Amino acid sequence: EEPKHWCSIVYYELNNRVGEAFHASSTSVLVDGFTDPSNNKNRFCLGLLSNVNRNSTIENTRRHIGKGVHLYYVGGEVYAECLSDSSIFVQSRNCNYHHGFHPTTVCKIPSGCSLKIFNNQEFAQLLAQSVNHGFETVYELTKMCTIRMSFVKGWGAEYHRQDVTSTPCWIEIHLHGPLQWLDKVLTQMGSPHNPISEVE
Amino acid sequence: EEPKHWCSIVYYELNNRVGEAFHASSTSVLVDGFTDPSNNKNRFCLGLLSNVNRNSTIENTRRHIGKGVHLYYVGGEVYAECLSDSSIFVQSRNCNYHHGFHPTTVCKIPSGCSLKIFNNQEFAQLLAQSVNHGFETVYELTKMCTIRMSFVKGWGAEYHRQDVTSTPCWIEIHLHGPLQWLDKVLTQMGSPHNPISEVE
Amino acid sequence: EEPKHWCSIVYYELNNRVGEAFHASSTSVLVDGFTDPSNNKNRFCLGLLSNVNRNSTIENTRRHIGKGVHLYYVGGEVYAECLSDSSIFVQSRNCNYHHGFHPTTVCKIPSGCSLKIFNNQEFAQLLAQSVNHGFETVYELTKMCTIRMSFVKGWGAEYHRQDVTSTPCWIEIHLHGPLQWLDKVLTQMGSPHNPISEVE
Amino acid sequence: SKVWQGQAFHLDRRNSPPNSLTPCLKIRNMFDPVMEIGDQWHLAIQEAILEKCSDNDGIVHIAVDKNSREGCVYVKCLSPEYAGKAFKALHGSWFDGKLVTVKYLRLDRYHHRFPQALTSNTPLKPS
Amino acid sequence: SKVWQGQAFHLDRRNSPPNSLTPCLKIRNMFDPVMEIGDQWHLAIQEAILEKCSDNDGIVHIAVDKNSREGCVYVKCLSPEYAGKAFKALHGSWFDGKLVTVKYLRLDRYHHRFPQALTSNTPLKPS
Amino acid sequence: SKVWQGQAFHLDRRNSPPNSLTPCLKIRNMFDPVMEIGDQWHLAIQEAILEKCSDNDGIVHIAVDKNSREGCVYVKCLSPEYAGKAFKALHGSWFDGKLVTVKYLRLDRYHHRFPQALTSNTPLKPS
């Protein structure tokens, strides 16, 4: 079954959310650093967004986003194509699970390269296998429905910026398809058999 | 007269707003901890929402939201029905005014219980009586058009968490009906006869 | 060419964003301090908005917003008309460029006065002249597509509040027309011929 | 189901019991008569009140209203101190998923509706 | 109504008066001729300028343009110092709800349009 | 165009090369046979692998699959140490805009498909 929007995107600068959320209305969405303010079709423009906590480091990185990233959803798969002149850095648990990479791995996509960052069938298969492992195992799959990604600046093990919140320009993508399918399993597994106080 | 949406809801974690606002499109809205990302009908799902300042305490509370709360608006009244396995904690000035409770009172709704948390006619009656008491008295009624409510963890006089901003998972509800009726009175009372500097 | 909405507005209290963004659907938009919650036509009401960091100073200023400001867009020009009983303080680079004022100048609009705060043709003319000065010169024009404005309290050179983020109640306006026209020039100028590291 | 589920808040400080000078109470939101079947269902309502007031040795007359949809049950006590003790036990408490509230009623009007309550003076207790 | 309402900003530092080397000014945005009635309305415009320039003992000729919708009034002074003093009083000030701006005009062209202004040399004052 | 563009991440610590006990590799995502023309195009694919493995003196047999759309090329080495050295050079690297991955293959099955590879033992090098 298909969702109203196949993904929604949110833009951050360091640890601060910037601008309104973007909701995709076509299979192709462009996240660039220009200034067209219609965020209701295929283009998510970041150049027009204001941030009262912006600094010189963030400002210089936004100047190099350029054409940015082309995210599209064709044939049950999601791709990231780096149209920018600078690289982008994607962390996708579903992509990492596919290639045997460590789940926390950040993949550098150099300018001009494309990477398959999600596969619907693999998630749906992982979801079905996860049901027999308990509620916590299926609830952990929520983490797989998000993809975080930064412009220009890298993050992860090799870089001084360990967390994506240390990068000056990044976005977070929510894959509504997987979230919908996960929801219909989570609502039929009940709740954890654990206690929680109301005072502590 | 009836508003486009009878309420809008906003979700917080401690002192941070999380996610986009929810706008009701039916008389029944569900706020639960699952992951369906369509926030344009009857379900407001919190499990899919990200927060870069989330910690272990908040994360454990979200696991126990479960089916959450059922808010519905039938026959000029608003109800809160606790579908969660853990309790919810509602603060409703209009509800408190009805029963003679202190205006700041927080009401524990145990799992399976329902509470009437607003009555339109009582507000409209209070509004008409308030007009003869001055602008400030009517402007104070703005506070009555919001209902704050937390999941799992209590707050108020008895609890170490004095303010709702100390609870890990809470929402704030805006009742658009009352706000609309209050607006048409506030705009016909002028302004306060007070001074304000432009320098201090 | 005309945009879907001619402007969008965002409300701040000190350094905190408050409420959802407002998108104009008519040539006339009213930003006042009352409580009508329909932010999908001509009225942007600030009285109903919550802020967990609000203090006594901000609260007293909101009481004096009153009828607020009337922003309208007729004949390729934008006007600010101060309907409030207290003054408003507008900073508009396009307005400053017109009269020879310093680009950072904040203009006090006393109660009852109107000021022309944007002219489309002047911007379009400045855009065409800017293309022959390089990418950076045209990208600087992004700053001209926003107008910041505070209620009651002044800011700028004369006031202790140097930045608008020191005022308790202000809004930021994004002019979608200019942003659209600037976008179609920025996307045809390429990118700056500068380097940026991925590690620093 | 038909169980007590604690209190919505603690009756102290800002929500202190009024301790009115009457021995008569009206208890609210305890049932819906159109959702009860037979004519034995009021006994479970009377017993539920005594179970929640097991400590109280002062309730003497109890009457369940089987017609009002408010779900009211009336109680009279020996002294206002006993009536206040029952107020603290019931007001703001959760029964069968609904919030119970208590109101004081004037003593003259109570006997007018329930004349049987004058002789009723032996304390009532749960089973 | 037809009142002065302060200045939009203070003319100092970054918005300093140019002090041009001319005694001639063009004052802008002071009225709309199509919203004035009769032919006595210009006196209130001339007096409003002198009331705002009550300190200035150097205005000698004042002319209101009753045709331009720009709402212009022309003034000539004795020396550029007097013209700068009138600039500071008017530029950036609020009159009848609109923002007044001032521009310097060349001296040769001023006399070409208003030849009467040569002999006009006595200072003008409010009533 | 047909250029190497670094690696998607560094193969160390959490993504360490397995160093399997085989000398045989399958290299992936290197081309699309339907977007190649002529029958000389495989030489550029073989040379690109040797250019990226210029240090490796242990590749002995290289075979490009011109039918699979997976874009596979098979390589056999002298010892598993040489095969691991080629793994580090290729796995996670960017070629012609696509991400190359490497998989180990069993030695018995490799010879079954490429029987020519037994005698192929002289090292291969770029031009």
Author numbering:
A (entry chain A), B (entry chain A), C (entry chain A): 266 to 465
D (entry chain B), E (entry chain B), F (entry chain B): 762 to 888
What did the publication describing this PDB structure actually write?
MAN1, an integral protein of the inner nuclear membrane, is a SMAD cofactor that terminates TGF-β superfamily signals. The SMAD2–MAN1 and SMAD1–MAN1 complex structures show that an intramolecular UHM–ULM interaction of MAN1 forms a hydrophobic surface that interacts with a hydrophobic surface among the H2 helix, the strands β8 and β9, and the L3 loop of the MH2 domains of R-SMAD proteins.
The SMAD1–MAN1 complex contains two SMAD1 protomers (chains A and B) and two MAN1 molecules (chains C and D) in its asymmetric unit and forms two SMAD1–MAN1 complexes. Each SMAD1 forms a trimeric structure with symmetrically related SMAD1 structures generated by a crystallographic three-fold axis. The SMAD1–MAN1 complex structure shows that the MAN1 binding mechanism of SMAD1 is approximately the same as that of SMAD2; the SMAD1 MH2 domain binds MAN1 using the hydrophobic surface of the H2 helix, the strands β8 and β9, and the L3 loop. By contrast, the hydrogen bonds and salt bridges around Arg775 of MAN1 in the SMAD2–MAN1 complex are not observed in the SMAD1–MAN1 complex. The MAN1 binding surface is highly conserved between SMAD2 and SMAD1 except for Tyr366 and Trp368 of SMAD2; Tyr366 and Trp368 of SMAD2 are substituted for His364 and Phe366 in SMAD1, respectively. When the structure of SMAD2–MAN1 complex and that of SMAD1–MAN1 complex are compared, the distances between the MAN1 Phe770 and the MH2 domains of SMAD2 and SMAD1 are different; the minimum side chain distance between the MAN1 Phe770 and the SMAD2 Trp368 is 3.7 Å (between chains B and E in the SMAD2–MAN1 complex), although that between the MAN1 Phe770 and the SMAD1 Phe366 is 3.3 Å (between chains A and B in the SMAD1–MAN1 complex). This difference suggests that the hydrophobic core between SMAD1 and MAN1 is more compact than that between SMAD2 and MAN1. ITC experiments showed that Trx-MAN1(762–890)-SDED bound to SMAD1C-2E and SMAD2C-2E with dissociation constants of 0.35 and 3.3 μM, respectively.
